[PDB]
Short mmCIF file of C-alpha atoms in Angstrom, two decimals:
data_model
loop_
_atom_site.label_atom_id
_atom_site.label_comp_id
_atom_site.label_asym_id
_atom_site.label_seq_id
_atom_site.Cartn_x
_atom_site.Cartn_y
_atom_site.Cartn_z
CA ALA A 1 11.80 -12.23 26.37
CA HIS A 2 14.38 -9.66 25.24
CA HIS A 3 14.17 -8.07 21.78
CA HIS A 4 16.07 -5.36 20.07
CA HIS A 5 16.55 -4.24 16.50
CA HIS A 6 19.65 -4.66 14.43
CA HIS A 7 21.60 -1.51 13.61
CA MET A 8 20.51 -1.51 9.96
CA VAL A 9 16.87 -1.46 11.04
CA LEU A 10 17.47 1.43 13.44
CA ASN A 11 19.30 3.34 10.64
CA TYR A 12 15.87 4.27 9.23
CA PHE A 13 15.42 6.60 12.26
CA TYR A 14 17.32 9.52 13.73
CA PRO A 15 19.57 8.09 16.49
CA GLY A 16 17.60 7.49 19.68
CA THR A 17 14.23 8.58 18.23
CA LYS A 18 11.22 6.91 16.52
CA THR A 19 11.35 9.54 13.76
CA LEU A 20 12.08 8.37 10.27
CA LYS A 21 15.12 10.12 8.71
CA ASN A 22 13.67 12.61 6.23
CA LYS A 23 14.62 15.10 3.60
CA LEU A 24 12.89 17.94 5.52
CA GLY A 25 15.04 17.44 8.64
CA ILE A 26 11.88 17.17 10.71
CA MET A 27 12.78 15.60 14.11
CA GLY A 28 9.27 15.41 15.66
CA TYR A 29 7.30 12.17 14.95
CA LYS A 30 3.89 13.86 14.97
CA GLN A 31 5.13 16.77 12.83
CA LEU A 32 6.67 14.43 10.24
CA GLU A 33 3.51 12.33 10.06
CA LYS A 34 1.24 15.36 9.50
CA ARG A 35 3.56 16.72 6.85
CA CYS A 36 3.73 13.42 5.01
CA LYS A 37 -0.05 13.32 4.90
CA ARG A 38 -0.25 16.86 3.57
CA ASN A 39 2.36 16.30 0.89
CA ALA A 40 0.74 13.00 -0.24
CA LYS A 41 -2.77 14.53 -0.58
CA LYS A 42 -1.42 17.32 -2.74
CA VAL A 43 0.09 14.61 -5.01
CA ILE A 44 -3.15 12.54 -5.01
CA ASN A 45 -4.81 15.70 -6.29
CA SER A 46 -2.35 16.08 -9.22
CA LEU A 47 -2.80 12.41 -10.18
CA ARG A 48 -6.50 13.07 -10.87
CA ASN A 49 -5.63 14.95 -14.13
CA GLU A 50 -2.71 12.67 -15.09
CA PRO A 51 -3.14 9.88 -17.57
CA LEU A 52 -3.56 6.31 -16.49
CA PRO A 53 -0.63 4.00 -17.30
CA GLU A 54 -0.89 1.23 -19.88
CA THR A 55 0.32 -1.39 -17.42
CA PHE A 56 -0.51 -1.75 -13.82
CA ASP A 57 2.56 -3.39 -12.26
CA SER A 58 5.07 -3.01 -9.40
CA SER A 59 6.95 -0.49 -11.53
CA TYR A 60 3.90 1.77 -11.51
CA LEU A 61 3.42 1.07 -7.79
CA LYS A 62 7.06 2.23 -7.14
CA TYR A 63 6.53 5.27 -9.37
CA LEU A 64 3.46 6.21 -7.29
CA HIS A 65 5.31 5.76 -3.98
CA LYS A 66 8.12 8.03 -5.26
CA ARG A 67 5.50 10.65 -6.22
CA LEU A 68 3.68 10.42 -2.89
CA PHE A 69 6.73 10.43 -0.56
CA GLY A 70 9.67 11.68 -2.61
CA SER A 71 9.67 15.09 -0.99
CA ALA A 72 10.01 13.38 2.42
CA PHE A 73 12.09 10.22 2.01
CA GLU A 74 15.34 9.44 0.20
CA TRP A 75 14.04 5.89 -0.15
CA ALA A 76 10.61 6.72 -1.72
CA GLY A 77 10.08 4.28 -4.62
CA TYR A 78 12.60 1.80 -3.26
CA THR A 79 11.46 -1.54 -1.83
CA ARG A 80 12.48 -2.47 1.69
CA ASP A 81 14.20 -5.77 0.76
CA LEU A 82 17.12 -3.83 -0.68
CA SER A 83 19.86 -2.33 1.47
CA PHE A 84 19.29 1.39 1.35
CA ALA A 85 22.28 3.79 1.22
CA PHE A 86 21.35 7.12 2.91
CA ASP A 87 23.16 10.31 2.03
CA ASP A 88 24.41 10.31 5.64
CA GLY A 89 26.53 7.21 4.88
CA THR A 90 24.40 4.72 6.84
CA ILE A 91 22.84 1.67 5.29
CA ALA A 92 19.38 0.61 6.29
CA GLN A 93 17.32 -2.48 5.93
CA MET A 94 13.93 -3.78 6.97
CA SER A 95 13.58 -7.50 6.19
CA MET A 96 10.83 -8.10 8.77
CA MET A 97 7.68 -6.07 9.44
CA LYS A 98 4.61 -7.07 11.36
CA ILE A 99 1.19 -5.82 12.40
CA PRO A 100 1.83 -3.78 15.54
CA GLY A 101 0.62 -5.64 18.68
CA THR A 102 0.69 -9.05 16.94
CA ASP A 103 3.04 -11.76 15.82
CA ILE A 104 1.54 -11.51 12.31
CA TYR A 105 4.20 -10.66 9.67
CA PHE A 106 4.10 -9.14 6.23
CA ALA A 107 6.27 -10.77 3.60
CA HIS A 108 9.90 -11.30 4.49
CA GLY A 109 12.28 -9.12 2.48
CA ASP A 110 13.76 -12.29 0.96
CA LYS A 111 10.44 -12.92 -0.86
CA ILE A 112 9.42 -9.37 -1.84
CA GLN A 113 10.97 -9.49 -5.35
CA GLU A 114 9.44 -12.86 -6.12
CA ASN A 115 6.06 -11.82 -4.69
CA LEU A 116 5.95 -8.56 -6.68
CA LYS A 117 6.78 -10.57 -9.80
CA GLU A 118 3.83 -12.88 -8.98
CA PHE A 119 1.56 -9.82 -8.46
CA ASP A 120 2.71 -8.47 -11.83
CA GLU A 121 2.06 -11.78 -13.58
CA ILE A 122 -1.53 -12.09 -12.20
CA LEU A 123 -2.35 -8.61 -13.53
CA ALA A 124 -0.71 -9.32 -16.89
CA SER A 125 -2.50 -12.66 -17.32
CA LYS A 126 -5.80 -10.80 -16.76
CA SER A 127 -5.07 -7.64 -18.77
CA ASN A 128 -5.20 -5.35 -15.75
CA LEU A 129 -8.73 -6.75 -14.84
CA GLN A 130 -10.25 -5.18 -17.96
CA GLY A 131 -13.40 -6.54 -19.54
CA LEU A 132 -14.93 -7.91 -16.28
CA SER A 133 -18.37 -7.68 -14.67
CA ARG A 134 -18.44 -5.72 -11.35
CA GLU A 135 -18.75 -9.12 -9.59
CA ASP A 136 -15.60 -10.59 -11.17
CA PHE A 137 -13.76 -7.29 -10.81
CA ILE A 138 -14.52 -7.27 -7.07
CA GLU A 139 -13.48 -10.93 -6.63
CA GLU A 140 -10.17 -10.42 -8.43
CA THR A 141 -9.37 -7.09 -6.76
CA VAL A 142 -10.08 -8.50 -3.29
CA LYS A 143 -7.50 -11.25 -3.89
CA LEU A 144 -4.90 -8.96 -5.50
CA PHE A 145 -5.38 -6.25 -2.87
CA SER A 146 -4.97 -8.74 0.02
CA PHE A 147 -1.86 -10.08 -1.68
CA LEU A 148 -0.26 -6.65 -2.11
CA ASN A 149 -1.29 -5.66 1.47
CA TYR A 150 0.53 -8.81 2.71
CA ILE A 151 3.63 -7.95 0.68
CA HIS A 152 3.95 -4.42 2.16
CA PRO A 153 6.96 -3.83 -0.06
CA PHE A 154 7.97 -0.29 1.22
CA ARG A 155 9.46 0.83 4.54
CA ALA A 156 6.31 2.87 5.09
CA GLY A 157 3.52 4.47 3.06
CA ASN A 158 2.23 1.12 1.84
CA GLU A 159 -1.42 1.64 2.52
CA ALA A 160 -1.53 5.11 0.93
CA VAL A 161 0.13 3.90 -2.27
CA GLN A 162 -1.95 0.70 -2.61
CA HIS A 163 -5.15 2.75 -2.28
CA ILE A 164 -4.34 5.10 -5.19
CA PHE A 165 -2.94 2.18 -7.26
CA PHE A 166 -6.22 0.32 -6.92
CA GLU A 167 -8.36 3.43 -7.54
CA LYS A 168 -6.42 4.02 -10.82
CA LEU A 169 -6.72 0.31 -11.69
CA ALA A 170 -10.49 0.39 -11.24
CA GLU A 171 -10.86 3.61 -13.28
CA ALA A 172 -8.90 2.00 -16.12
CA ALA A 173 -11.04 -1.17 -15.96
CA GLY A 174 -14.35 0.70 -16.17
CA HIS A 175 -15.31 0.40 -12.52
CA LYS A 176 -14.72 2.63 -9.50
CA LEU A 177 -13.07 2.28 -6.15
CA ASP A 178 -12.99 5.07 -3.57
CA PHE A 179 -11.25 4.33 -0.31
CA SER A 180 -12.33 7.75 1.14
CA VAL A 181 -15.96 6.44 1.39
CA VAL A 182 -15.13 4.55 4.65
CA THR A 183 -12.99 5.25 7.70
CA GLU A 184 -9.39 4.37 8.35
CA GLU A 185 -10.59 1.98 11.14
CA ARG A 186 -12.77 0.07 8.64
CA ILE A 187 -10.02 -0.20 6.07
CA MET A 188 -7.43 -1.37 8.60
CA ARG A 189 -9.85 -3.91 10.14
CA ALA A 190 -10.35 -5.51 6.71
CA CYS A 191 -6.60 -5.50 6.05
CA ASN A 192 -5.69 -6.88 9.48
CA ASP A 193 -8.47 -9.54 9.22
CA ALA A 194 -7.21 -10.63 5.76
CA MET A 195 -3.85 -11.49 7.38
CA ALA A 196 -5.10 -12.72 10.79
CA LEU A 197 -8.04 -14.95 9.85
CA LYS A 198 -8.10 -18.05 7.56
CA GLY A 199 -9.67 -19.15 4.34
CA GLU A 200 -13.16 -18.01 3.58
CA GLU A 201 -13.40 -15.76 6.67
CA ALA A 202 -10.26 -13.84 5.57
CA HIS A 203 -11.59 -13.35 1.98
CA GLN A 204 -14.97 -12.10 3.35
CA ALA A 205 -13.30 -9.47 5.52
CA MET A 206 -11.85 -7.78 2.46
CA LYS A 207 -14.86 -8.43 0.17
CA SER A 208 -17.20 -6.37 2.46
CA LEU A 209 -14.78 -3.46 2.21
CA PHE A 210 -14.62 -3.75 -1.56
CA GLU A 211 -18.41 -3.87 -1.89
CA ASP A 212 -18.72 -0.70 0.25
CA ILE A 213 -16.17 1.37 -1.72
CA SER A 214 -17.19 0.33 -5.26
CA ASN A 215 -20.41 2.32 -5.80
CA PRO A 216 -22.80 -0.41 -4.53
CA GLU A 217 -25.64 2.16 -4.76
CA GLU A 218 -25.65 1.71 -8.54
CA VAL A 219 -28.39 -0.94 -8.04
CA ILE A 220 -30.74 1.84 -6.96
CA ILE A 221 -32.62 2.86 -10.05
CA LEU A 222 -33.78 6.51 -10.02
CA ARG A 223 -34.98 6.86 -13.66
CA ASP A 224 -37.92 9.05 -12.59
CA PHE A 225 -35.72 11.81 -11.02
#
């Protein structure tokens, strides 16, 4: 059955292309993508010698997105629920986003503000997951990470920002997460399963990922080295 996108949704791209409007004026999809990755890694590198924030919240998450993608996108740091005014005079919007190839949607734009508030309140009620065993830290991060993944509050760059956010959160809490330990395919399978499956099966998809990236080899005692 027929589908096409509203004009405000298409205003994220150059007319007649699938290339996101960008500050570099890069018209090629592949070339933009590669350059975004390069820019973002450079920034991830800087963040290693920057202080951790006092509060992990959506404000920090927006700050990080602006850092990661601000050289590329006018809208870096802005959440996709809001109408976005480009310098070119167009106004863009992305209320609905789904997992490509599915009918499985991320949060509707109408709920993003409320949902980010709820995210913020869970972290505040638990003091940024400080003072926890590795077991409780994994349980609570799995839930919070699935929730933020579902929200997908930016036009793009969601996964990259949520990874660094959670790596910084774990560092601050006295644990460690390192998403680079596993492949993209493994990460995206856990994320897609968290949204596609139900109940206990959905939680377990993401828990296996979290166990793998959180220094599980710490149980190996090598005192005699």
